[PDB]
Design a protein around this ligand. Sequence first.
Ligand code: MG
Lengths: 82, 85
Amino acid sequence: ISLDWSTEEVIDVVHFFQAIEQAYDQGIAREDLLGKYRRFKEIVPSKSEEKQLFRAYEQENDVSCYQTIKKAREEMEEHIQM
Amino acid sequence: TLPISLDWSTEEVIDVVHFFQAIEQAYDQGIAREDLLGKYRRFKEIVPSKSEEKQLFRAYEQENDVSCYQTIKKAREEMEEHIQM
Ligand SMILES: [Mg+2]
């Protein structure tokens, strides 16, 4: 059973997608991006919901939320640029 | 015609498992268009190669009465949210 979001949670999710965009712009610190992702997953624990949000966001933006986060999780590079 | 070998992470294996389960769900009680496509999108993140995708669909369909192509095609082209094959 899923839980509805508080206004604070909505903002945290907005910040997450803005972090993804930042990765494709001037870049973002690994620690920053992972922190935004950690928070995103606290709010969206469902793997299915995550996939739906990622696809919906990518429909209008030429980015890959999955590949960006995968890189941040697996690589030790301090600065991430997609 | 090269013999395919797949190198996926643990989570990616499960993402692929969820994709095929999604296709099966479409033939059972049905599934939401958005969920199905979300899982197909992830499948393509893991299997960007069209040749690998084609062979995986074939491998699954050889033992399961479903059509990955028909299901995703219908989902992509039609607007109804509830998809049932
Ligand atoms: Mg409710």
